Write a protein that binds this ligand. Structure first.
Ligand SMILES: Nc1ncnc2c1ncn2[C@@H]1O[C@H](COP(=O)(O)OP(=O)(O)NP(=O)(O)O)[C@@H](O)[C@H]1O
Ligand SMILES: Nc1ncnc2c1ncn2[C@@H]1O[C@H](COP(=O)(O)OP(=O)(O)NP(=O)(O)O)[C@@H](O)[C@H]1O
Ligand SMILES: [Mg+2]
Ligand SMILES: [Mg+2]
Ligand SMILES: [Mg+2]
Ligand SMILES: [Mg+2]
Lengths: 578, 575
């Protein structure tokens, strides 16, 4: 898009200046950074400033910085291959006078297409820096006013930490337009809400408010002031200053990987200023600063209003909190309180763990969960039937990270987690219920022994009477430390996309505990016809099909769909005549 | 203090690491001299001079390389490598002169150290001398007979002159080294064992390379190169025989990142910057020639070895190659291997599939699965197999993508058996017989479309691809199959999210039925008797839900499926 930018930004026509001030300030950051390890880098031009002149006589607008500038080699690359082209929205011809420490002064000219670089016939005028000169077009020929620049600078120079002067009448002399003092250095009581929002937009754009922000000052082992932000959306970051001097935004180990979405500034008066980037990154004080940034980020996330947290924060950054529980051992408890999940308590609303706890029964000491690939799968599962009926709430885990997240959290507020698809599910039992159960177990013993010893031999660990089923005839339960259906699934996907066929593992190719419902009509009939004739194949063929459907119902992959299907066929044939 | 009596087996390797280091220092100062004329001021020469001393019990390894500054001496020297010098000595004296600093002396007694300015001052001009005060238990190294064979043993591929202090019965330096590079020699004269020894000199891998190629490039650019294929999953750039770098990451395309070798060009600029030389026009011409010659090498590998060994290791690289490299796609397509229904385990080439194709067969049929077993027991391939058509099986994630980037092989288009478009030719007697049976089952076709499976299927038709299977779900040509439903939705669940309202995930499929199948015949038989019957209603849904799993898709509602199954199980027992 050559000339297809002028019309798409006819709204933001005045931003040409903001884009130039931005560039000037960046150039000033770079040379100031070089001078921290080179005592005579400022020798060409002592001051670090932004100067703007209106040359209405010649139709020129001058933006002069005393920054790093550009070399002969840098002029042909950087100025060619928003941004710098923003100048062409108000200028037909663009000329930049520039002087770098490692080369002589040159003048770069361009209409918009081709280019040419010549040495400035005047010699070295700036000493160091760059002057952006714009041959201002007809409709833009009004910026060269004694108040237009004055007012535009005073709104687009906000948050520029270098002094900006304009050549003005009063005698023609420079006049300071901005305030050099950083807003992160100002006390919180004085900084307005709009100012914090405007700051967020100034270094990340997007023209929408941050989700949240925190402005703090640190006391103790290390001293620094900081402003941190939570963006409104997960993008699909942190600027470090030492004694008010910009150093870098390339330090990625500032925040742990789970809090990578956080944006902001850190200004430390304790870090070494007159040192290299490699030395500062591995500095011991940085690890202290980091621990403080994480805690203050979590303070900020915690402060988000209840509804907004669930409806907005959780939706974008819930996974990050889940990864946080796994990574951040020292902040685990704070993070566990930030977790939100779906549960049987409501069809869609998410719940905290504290809210789950408050809803618990007096003698319930396990936080129950069902892990699936979708809510629907998890909620229509055979394992939640009795729990739900008797009023136990079950958390539903529908993302693959969820199970590693729970698996990394031994307890929550004195309560241990229990996977309903696994051994360890308990119901408080009255003496009447308890005894009525023991009678059932003995009544169904000839069916349990038949299933284990012949019908389903070498398929199941054992066959028992279940206490977790309502509507379902049977289900497959994994051992307490074994793999569930959801884990088998997650692992098989991982072993296919990356792994080298982990078929003969340990607790992957193992048999499960086959639990039956003594009140289900079909199991009742099955007990009857087995005691009469144990070698009745019609019952034996029916046990296999029932077991294989339980496999699917339980969340496990079927070992051979061809055979299963062929059984279903035979069943359907002897269910009619076909 | 756990290396002295173990590292031894390789016990005399202290010299190899010291020769290697000297050569690196020599390589580095020469690299600086290309842009800087004042680099070789202290010394004009670039040598390695080893010297023996019986009386003082000292062994000096002297180089005229870059040298080390005082700051570097403290950091670099200390904790394979430089430490190996403590296997034969218990005190290493390092004298070093660098262009940016005065001459210093570093000494270490394996534990502690010290670094002071040399009392003698500048005696080296530029470089380092490593003095070894040998142990009296392993001081055999100061013997002329021993040192002469030891330097030749570890300087075969060192391209700087190595000298030793010797005499003829007149003391002077002698050359134990031929600095003409292996790549610059004529291809005929270089022995096979020399190419192998060269591979281990820079890879430090011990084992042989799987394959190698040594060629001289001609035409648009001229260079000499030796490229290697390793046995299990870095290119050195030289200009005018002068080492430049090995940090040019894009020398080879990403798919061929396993290739190791050297490139020596007399057409590239020498006295220029690394940044500049990386973007030079001739380098891209070299890059294109490296790929083609690499592929030439991969093609020269014998048949069995290719499938048994190359394919097992780098097969995935070739598949990624077909996708990445548009220019060499046709060359790469011929390197692809897949399993097929021709043999239970053997993999086949596409040319081999083509040679087996039927007279008037225009398509290469493929079935994609999570494993071979699901692919080979798919309803989709039933009649193709029976009629003698071969089906390629795609059991890996990349496969789907690989074939997709290949619009044709040798004039043939690929056909997914899970998708509409499988062809079976027929005579007028077969075409009319089909059109008769098709109109015979049409009442059932509309009953399944408008009653039984009203909003679950796109259309119900009579299949020509089944033998044993009663039915199957067939995908649209512009739709997703079962395997692609996975690949996509096991990444929307894994990474993506909110893909319920996707492109075509909740899209209905074509429900094909087998007219010769007992259950489909008796379903047609009973569809005219009542129709309002809930037994055939259940029969058809249960069969449709079983066809789904059987077709590679997933069951909408598993519970409802279970509930159906058990009502049928009620009939088969209590009745
Ligand atoms: N005043 C200046 N002094 C020195 N170099 C400059 C100046 N203005 C522009 N440049 C060079 O031109 C390049 C592009 O500038 P610009 O198009 O504004 O993008 P940017 O500032 O790098 N990033 P953005 O903030 O998105 O515009 C910069 O990387 C500089 O190297
Ligand atoms: N003769 C020498 N001249 C200049 N520098 C040297 C010399 N010998 C060793 N060094 C320095 O000491 C460092 C450590 O050497 P060494 O322990 O052999 O590892 P390395 O040379 O970096 N790589 P490698 O030898 O493959 O393990 C090197 O990085 C060199 O900078
Ligand atoms: Mg910019
Ligand atoms: Mg069958
Ligand atoms: Mg070494
Ligand atoms: Mg039921």
């Amino acid at each position: 898009m050559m000339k297809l930018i002028i019309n798409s930004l006819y709204k933001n026509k005045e931003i040409f200046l903001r884009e130039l001030i931005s560039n000037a300030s960046d150039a000033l950051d770079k040379i100031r950074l070089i001078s921290l390890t080179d005592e005579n880098a400022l020798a060409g031009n002592e001051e670090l400033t932004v100067k703007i002149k209106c040359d209405k006589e010649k139709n020129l607008l001058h933006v002069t910085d005393t920054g790093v500038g550009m070399t002969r080699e840098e002029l042909v690359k950087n100025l060619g291959t928003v941004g710098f082209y923003s100048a062409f929205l108000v200028a037909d011809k663009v000329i930049v006078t520039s002087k770098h420490n490692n080369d002589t002064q040159h003048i770069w000219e361009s209409d918009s297409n081709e280019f040419s670089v010549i040495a400035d016939p005047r010699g070295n005028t700036l000493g160091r820096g760059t002057t952006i000169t714009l041959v201002l077009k007809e409709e833009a020929s009004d910026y060269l006013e004694l108040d237009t620049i004055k007012n535009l600078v005073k709104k687009y120079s906000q948050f520029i930490n270098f002094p900006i002067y304009v050549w003005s009448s009063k005698v023609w002399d420079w006049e300071l337009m901005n305030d050099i003092k950083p807003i992160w250095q100002r006390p919180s009581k004085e900084v307005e809400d709009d100012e914090y929002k405007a700051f967020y937009k100034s270094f990340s754009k997007e023209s929408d408010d941050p989700m949240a922000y925190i402005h703090f000052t640190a006391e103790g082992e290390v001293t620094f002031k900081s402003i941190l932000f939570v963006p409104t959306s997960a993008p699909r970051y942190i600027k470090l200053y030492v004694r008010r001097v910009f150093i870098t935004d390339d330090f990625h180990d500032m925040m742990p990987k789970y809090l990578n979405f956080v944006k902001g500034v850190v200004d430390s008066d304790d870090l070494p200023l007159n040192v290299s980037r490699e030395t500062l990154q591995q500095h011991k004080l940085l690890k202290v600063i980091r621990k403080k940034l994480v805690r203050k980020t979590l303070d900020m996330i915690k402060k988000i209003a209840d509804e907004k947290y669930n409806d907005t924060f959780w939706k974008e950054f819930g996974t990050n909190i889940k990864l946080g529980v796994i990574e951040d051992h020292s902040n685990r408890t704070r993070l566990a309180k930030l977790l939100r999940f779906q549960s049987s308590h409501h069809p869609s609303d998410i719940t905290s763990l504290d809210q789950y706890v408050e809803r618990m029964k007096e003698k319930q000491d396990k936080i129950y969960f069902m892990a699936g690939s979708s809510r629907k799968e998890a909620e229509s599962s055979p394992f939640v039937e009795r729990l739900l009926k008797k009023g136990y709430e079950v958390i539903y885990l529908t993302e693959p990270v969820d199970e590693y997240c729970i698996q990394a959290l031994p307890e929550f507020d004195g309560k241990r987690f229990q996977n309903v698809a696994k051994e360890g599910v308990k119901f408080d039992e009255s003496e009447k219920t308890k005894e009525s159960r023991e009678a059932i177990e003995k009544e169904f013993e000839p069916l349990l022994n038949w299933m284990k010893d012949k019908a389903l031999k070498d398929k199941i660990e054992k066959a028992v009477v279940s206490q977790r089923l309502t509507e379902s005839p049977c289900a497959l339960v994994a051992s307490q430390y074994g793999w569930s259906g959801n884990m088998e699934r997650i692992m098989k996907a991982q072993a296919y996309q990356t792994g080298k066929d982990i078929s003969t593992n340990y607790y992957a190719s193992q048999k499960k505990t086959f639990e039956i419902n003594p009140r289900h009509p079909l199991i009742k009939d099955m007990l009857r016809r087995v005691k009469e004739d144990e070698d009745d194949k019609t019952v034996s063929d029916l046990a296999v099909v029932l077991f294989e459907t339980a496999t699917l119902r339980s969340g496990y992959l079927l070992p051979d769909t061809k055979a299963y299907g062929d059984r279903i066929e035979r069943m359907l044939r002897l269910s009619l005549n076909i």
